Amino acid sequence: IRLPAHLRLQPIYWSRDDVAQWLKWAENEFSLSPIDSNTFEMNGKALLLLTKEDFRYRSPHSGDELYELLQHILKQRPSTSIRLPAHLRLQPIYWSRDDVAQWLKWAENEFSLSPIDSNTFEMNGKALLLLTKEDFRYRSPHSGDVLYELLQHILGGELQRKIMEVELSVHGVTHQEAQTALGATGGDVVSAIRNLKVDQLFHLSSRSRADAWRILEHYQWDLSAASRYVLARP
C-alpha cells in the first residue's frame, strides 16, 4: 500500500480535497469503476464515521474495496474526538429545535459537508433519537449517514464521560471496575462513587460498613479525611 506524498497524513487529518484525491488514486490503483468525486463530499474525520454499509450505498461497485482499503491504511499506523461546542454540550435528549439546527451548522463546517438546510430536522433532540439511519439518509442524501453516526458518537461519549468520573474519583479503581460499578447503580455516577469510597474506607476500618457510610457522609466524602479518622481509631 504505497500512498502518494500528499495522502500520507493520517486519514483523520484529510481534508475534503484529500478525500477526493484518495478516491482518484484508488480507482487507478485497483482498476475500479469510476466514481463521482462528490460521492464522499466530506473530510477525513467524517469518512472514518461511515460504516461499511454506508460505503456500499455511496458506491455500489467499489464501496467494499474502498472501505477495506481505508482499513488497511488505518492498520499501518495509529484518538479522534468530537470537539463539541459549549452550546452543544447538553445531551441530545435535552436538545431543543434550535439546538438541533446549531448542531447541523456546526457539523457542516466540522466535517466539510454539503450545505444542510435547517428544515431537514424540524424537531427537538427527543424526536431525533427515534429517527432511524434510513430516515437520516432520506432527509439528507449527502450527509445523513454522517449525521446519524455523529449522533451515535455523541451519545456514546456521555457514558464514557461517566465512567471516567467514576474511576478518577478514587485511586486504585481500574477502568473496568468503574464501568462495572456504574452499571450496578444504573448509571448513577454519584452513587457509584459513593459505593467505591465506602468499600475502601470499610477495608481500612474494623467497624461496620454502615459505620463507614456515616463517617464519609459526615466528612462530606473526603476519603482522605475519613481515612485519617479511621486510621487513628484503635
UniProtKB/Swiss-Prot annotation:
Keywords: Acetylation, Chromosomal rearrangement, Disease variant, DNA-binding, Isopeptide bond, Nucleus, Phosphoprotein, Proto-oncogene, Repressor, Transcription, Transcription regulation, Ubl conjugation
GO molecular function: DNA-binding transcription activator activity, RNA polymerase II-specific; DNA-binding transcription factor activity; DNA-binding transcription factor activity, RNA polymerase II-specific; DNA-binding transcription repressor activity, RNA polymerase II-specific; protein domain specific binding; RNA polymerase II cis-regulatory region sequence-specific DNA binding; RNA polymerase II transcription regulatory region sequence-specific DNA binding
Sites annotated Breakpoint for translocation to form ETV6-MDS2 in MDS: 7-8, 88-89
Residues marked Breakpoint for translocation to form PAX5-ETV6 (site): 8-9, 89-90
Domain of life: Eukaryota
Family note: Belongs to the ETS family.
The protein's name: Transcription factor ETV6
Protein source organism: Homo sapiens
